[PDB]
Amino acid sequence: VFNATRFASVYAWNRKRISNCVADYSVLYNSASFSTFKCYGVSPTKLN
Amino acid sequence: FGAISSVLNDILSRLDPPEAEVQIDRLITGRLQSLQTYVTQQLIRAAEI
Structure with a gap:
């Protein structure tokens, strides 16, 4: 989703429909590369 | 009453307090007004009884 070669x-x-996982949002919360x-x-x- | 939900715990499980208060203010205003309506009608009926 995020480190994709090409959009x-x-x-x-x-x-994309994402289903059936344990999503762990705090690392995506924590990345400073996203402005x-x-x-x-x-x-x-509260996403965790 | 304009809130996102009618259930208290869902806001508290979802929101950060400096906007949760904005929601809870609406909730308590509506419910308090309803309670005031009920007690006024009860007073009138009690006088008639």
């Missing part, structure tokens, strides 16, 4: 265009935006990181329905710290 698609905005008018052909790529959708804008902001959440709307949920406060981001």
Whole structure:
């Protein structure tokens, strides 16, 4: 999802359904390489 | 009453308090108004009885 070689265009935006895992959001919360990181329905710290 | 949910624990399990308070304010305002309506109607009925 994130370290992908190539994306698609905005008018052909790529959708992927992620299912059946234990997602561990705090490392993706913690990476400073992502400039804008902001959440709307949920406060981001409660994702764990 | 405009809140995201009618259940208290879901906000608390989801939100950070400086917006959770903005939701809980709506919730307690609506419920307190309903309670005031109930007690007023009870007073009137009790006078008639």
